[PDB]
Amino acid sequence: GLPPGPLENSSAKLVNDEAHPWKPLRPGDIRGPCPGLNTLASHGYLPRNGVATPAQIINAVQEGFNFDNQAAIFLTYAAHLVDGNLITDLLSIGRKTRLTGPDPPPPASVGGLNEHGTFEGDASMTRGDAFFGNNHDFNETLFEQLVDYSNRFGGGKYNLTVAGELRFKRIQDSIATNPNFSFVDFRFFTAYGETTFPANLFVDGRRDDGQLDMDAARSFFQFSRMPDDFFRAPSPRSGTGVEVVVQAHPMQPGRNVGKINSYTVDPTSSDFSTPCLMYEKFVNITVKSLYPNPTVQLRKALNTNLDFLFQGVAAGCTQVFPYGR
């Protein structure tokens, strides 16, 4: 279906309401590395089994959290192109599942949001790097480090100052312990944006002060659960304030080269100075590598989803056509 449009009414409102109660997981229910999508599934804004269409995901992030339209479209279609089933139009917000339908041929993985190196990546705040065995479950030790950074830099609350310090700490921990640490292109951009999301979207919209308390933080990050009487943000937003996070500790994109403490800058990677290059490489390299010679029905589904992806790209970039027009 077409990408949904922006909210007709984007006011703050109760989103933890009678029609969207929190429910525990049933056997087979899928939760993944994103506490935003996990919470919408656990409140019934998304299907509770954690398998959804792109249009369902865009509608849920807007209705439940007031995520802005352009960001919703870009992230949803990027995730769907690399992790979703383009024929059935279904994406798992977590582990690979037969529930997304019959698979395309390799090398396409349709691995859900849990698939390492497509969307999900290293130096997550409350999830471990895939090298350590689990890139998707809430990690109590990592969350306690988020609390400690909130106590030291946020007076007990998570804010953009905390995000700047913790983002850099998680990069330095990955450099020191993960010999396969990768921090380039798509992951380089999304890792910085994700650290603003709690301050911009998990803060009750009646305050919208960018100060997230640790009870609310645990409720979202561990339990996929809105605080009692949670109001969504009072206007559409996503990564507002990412400039503060970067400015705290500016980093070049790069990777460890098979050893710890070997972080090597990648001059071929995009960075914040080349945002159009990030889009071009995502399409010409990442998507194309998963579908190099697609059959007629797959080509048509790719071209449709790539057009939808381009709707979320900031004005100024040129659309690229890996399968022709």
Ligand X SMILES: COCCCCCCCCCCCC(=O)O
Ligand Y SMILES: *[C@@H]1O[C@H](CO)[C@@H](O)[C@H](O)[C@H]1NC(C)=O
In sequence order, the β-bridge partners of residue 92 are 51
Q: Which of the ranges 10-18, 116-124, 250-258, 313-321 carries the binding residues for ligand X, by CB under 6 A?
A: 313-321
- What are the structure tokens assigned to 125, written together? 């705040």
* Residues between 127 and 186 that touch ligand HEM (CB under 6 A): 127
Restricting to residues 230-259, name those near ligand Y by CB under 6 A. none
| Closer by beta carbon to ligand Y, 53 or else 305 | 305
Residues pairing with 237 in the sheet: 67
Buried b (16+ CB within 10 A) or exposed e, 228-261: eebbbbbebbbbbbbebbeebeebebbbbeeeee
Should residue 190 be labelled a site residue for ligand X when binding is judged by CB under 6 A?
A: yes
The answer to the question of residue 236 lying near Cl ion (CB under 5 A) is yes
Identify the helix (H) or strand (E) that includes residue 281.
helix 275-281
What does DSSP say about strands 91-92 and 182-183: parallel, antiparallel, or unpaired? unpaired
Residue 312 interacts with ligand HEM (CB under 6 A): yes or no: no
Rounded Cα–Cα distance for residues 96 and 92 (Å): 7
Which residue numbers belong to the known binding site?
34
Give the span between the Cα atoms of 146 and 32, in whole angstroms.
19
Residue 4 binding result from ligand X, ligand HEM, ligand Y, none, given CB thresholds of 5 to 8 Å by partner type: none
Cα–Cα distances in angstroms (integers) from residue 267 to residues 71, 123, 252, 254, 271, in the given order: 26, 20, 9, 8, 9
Distances (CA, A) of 158 to 31, 124, 125, 190, 247: 23, 15, 12, 19, 17
**Minimum distance between the CB of residue 191 and ligand HEM, rounded to whole angstroms?**
7
| Residue 167 binding ligand Y, by CB under 6 A | no
From residue 22 to residue 61, what is the string marking binding to ligand X with x (rule CB under 6 A)? ----------------------------------------
Q: Which stretch binds ligand Y (CB under 6 A): 64-72, 126-134, 228-236, 300-308?
A: 126-134
**Member of 74, 158, 291, 308 binding ligand X (CB under 6 A):** 74
Interaction of residue 189 with ligand X, rule CB under 6 A:
yes
321 contributes a contact to ligand Y by CB under 6 A: yes
Cα–Cα distance, 319 to 321 (Å, whole number):
7
Binding-site partner at residue 216 among ligand X, Cl ion, ligand HEM, none, CB < 5 to 8 Å by type: none
DSSP, collapsed to helix, strand or coil, labels residue 55 as helix
In 66-179, alpha helices (H):
69-83, 140-153, 160-177
User: By the criterion CB under 6 A, which residues form the site for ligand HEM?
Assistant: 33-37, 57, 61, 65, 67, 72, 75-76, 79, 113, 119-121, 124-127, 194, 197-198, 201
The residue ranges that bind ligand Y (CB under 6 A) are 9, 11, 13, 116-117, 128, 130-131, 139, 141-142, 154-155, 159-161, 180, 182, 210, 277, 280-281, 284, 320-322
Q: Which residues bind Mg ion (CB under 5 A)?
A: 120, 124, 127, 135
